[PDB]
Amino acid sequence: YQEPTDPKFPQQWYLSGVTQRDLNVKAAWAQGYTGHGIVVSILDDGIEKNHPDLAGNYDPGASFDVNDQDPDPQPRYTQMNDNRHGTRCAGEVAAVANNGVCGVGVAYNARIGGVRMLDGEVTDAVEARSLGLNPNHIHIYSASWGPEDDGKTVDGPARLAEEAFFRGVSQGRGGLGSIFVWASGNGGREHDSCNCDGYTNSIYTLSISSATQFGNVPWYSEACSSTLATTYSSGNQNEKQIVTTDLRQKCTESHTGTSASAPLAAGIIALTLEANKNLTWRDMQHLVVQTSKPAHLNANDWATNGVGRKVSHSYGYGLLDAGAMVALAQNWTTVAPQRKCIIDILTEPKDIGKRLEVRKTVTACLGEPNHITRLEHAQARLTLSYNRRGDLAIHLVSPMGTRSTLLAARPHDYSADGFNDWAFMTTHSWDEDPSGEWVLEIENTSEANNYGTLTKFTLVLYGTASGSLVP
């Protein structure tokens, strides 16, 4: 195997490193996996399809302009180069290799397109038409953005966009399911908590956070239990950043944020799908859980879950490992059909006050076709009123003892509107047996005499009843 000769490949430290602080992508390339035959689409502000490092891999069938309603996602050029982000992300996935231009994509033989959908009013219809673009041609969708990362918003896909997610994972990709890769958010300095973003909090998105070059939680990171895994991105000014294609046929060394991490994950997932084109959308999440690596990622919340995996709310299961992903993909056995066990918990509404604990022992649908002994995602779907939402912290403890933070205190969130059947999701109990006692904790983190009521708590378990590995 000959590594890429591109002039900036040495600067792509998160691919080219020899110090073990990388995504182990060279290992996958040397196994023969470069993304050939895989199609990725960047949902963003457009894609410069004539960029010298993108043209060779550009795919019009992976592209559309939902903002102006035409097939051509070319960016709108402006004096501040506002609409450059999709081009940056496209190159992360699939910049052409060995062509003397900039660097390379993770999946430098994949086909790459873009949906121009952020340069205009983003409505539910816009979102749905983007997520649902050509779902039997595009394999993987990469989305770096969502509701405002202001630390006070709770929002998610409205009806058309949620329908697009379920159509995508159900019928997309020939029934194997569209793979939606999402950035968990850039709201760190606003103390944002990413389960309040219903796109990344969805089970249908494979959500990705960031690590700095020195292995730290970047200033912009949002912690939450819905995150699955991590890729490198930017940090402080002594740490390197992401190197990729830029608007106006240029090359940037200063692509940043969690919004730069999701495309790298999309590229790794493209390599993995080349290694096994039969993987379902859930198979892909299983591979990420099993192969991702905590080592050398610094966080004060690493915890071992009930099946012996370390998990963090900043990093999920750790750094994606492309070589491990493609290796495990090749002989992966398709997971069983997804089961869903619905448990209505409360017998009566509960005053929250300063603190509320709800304990419930469940059988996880014992005796039923939705009996789950092997958890995937779990949700606590909560309906509650409270006078100042951001003073709440919410935790969910599984029978195996795994304490998932569903909501951290959000100091800017002054809302008195509470949560209306909000489906807080955790990945941290993946592969655990969910039978037994679950505990929901709701706490007022402020000294104020806050008040409200929990009126509904639905525990929703997803998973299967066969095929577990030894912890």
Ligand X SMILES: *[C@@H]1O[C@H](CO)[C@@H](O)[C@H](O)[C@H]1NC(C)=O
- Which parts of this chain interact with ligand X (CB under 6 A)? 278, 334
Place of tokens 């990420």: 288
> Which of 9, 145, 281, 332 is the binder for ligand A1JA3 (CB under 6 A)?
145
Q: Which of 129, 165, 122 is nearest to 145 (CA)?
A: 122
Helix, strand, or coil (residue 156)? coil
Q: Check binding of 118 to ligand A1JA3 (CB under 6 A).
A: yes
Place of tokens 């959308």: 281
User: Phi and psi at residue 441, in whole multiples of 5°?
Assistant: -120, 125
155 known ligand binder: yes
301 known ligand binder: no
Two structure tokens written together for 1: 């195997």
Helix, strand, or coil (residue 19)? coil
Q: Within positions 66 to 95, which residues make up the interface with Ca ion, using CB under 5 A?
A: 68, 70, 72, 95
Q: What is the DSSP letter of 431?
A: T
Instruction: Provide the pairing of β-strand 64-65 with 436-444.
Output: unpaired
Are the beta carbons of 392 and 444 closer than 8 angstroms?
A: yes
Q: Within positions 181 to 200, which residues make up the interface with Ca ion, using CB under 5 A?
A: 185, 187, 192, 194, 197
Distance CA 123, CA 159 (A): 11
391 known ligand binder: no
> Which of 12, 34, 67, 130 is the binder for ligand A1JA3 (CB under 6 A)?
130
**Number of Cβ atoms within 10 Å of the Cβ of 174:** 11
Are the beta carbons of 238 and 74 closer than 8 angstroms?
A: no
Question: Catalytic positions, please?
Answer: 44, 85, 259
Give the chain's end-to-end CA distance (angstroms, integer): 35
185 known ligand binder: yes
Residue number with CB closer to Ca ion (99 or 453): 99
Distance CA 34, CA 267 (A): 9
User: Whole-number minimum distance, CB 195 to Na ion, in Å?
Assistant: 10
Binding mask 10-49 for ligand A1JA3 (x = CB under 6 A): ---------------------------------xx-----
Piece of the chain touching Ca ion by CB under 5 A; list 178-186, 206-214, 238-246, 451-459 = 178-186
User: Whole-number minimum distance, CB 376 to ligand X, in Å?
Assistant: 17
Q: Within positions 159 to 188, which residues make up the interface with ligand A1JA3, using CB under 6 A?
A: 161
344 known ligand binder: no
- CB-based closest residue to Ca ion: 185
Angle in degrees, 0-180, between the axes of helices 159-171 and 124-131, rounded to the nearest 10: 10
Question: b/e string for 100-116 if b means 16 or more Cβ within 10 A?
Answer: ebbbbbbbbbbbbbbbb
68 known ligand binder: no
Residue number with CB closer to ligand A1JA3 (22 or 127): 127
Question: Which residues sit in the known binding site?
Answer: 6, 45, 53, 65, 70, 72, 82-83, 96, 99, 101, 103, 127, 144-149, 155, 183-186, 192, 197, 199, 222, 259
* Site residues for Ca ion per CB under 5 A: 6, 53, 65, 68, 70, 72, 95-96, 99, 101-102, 149, 185, 187, 192, 194, 197
Q: Which residues bind ligand A1JA3 (CB under 6 A)?
A: 43-44, 118, 122-124, 127, 130-131, 143-147, 155, 158, 161
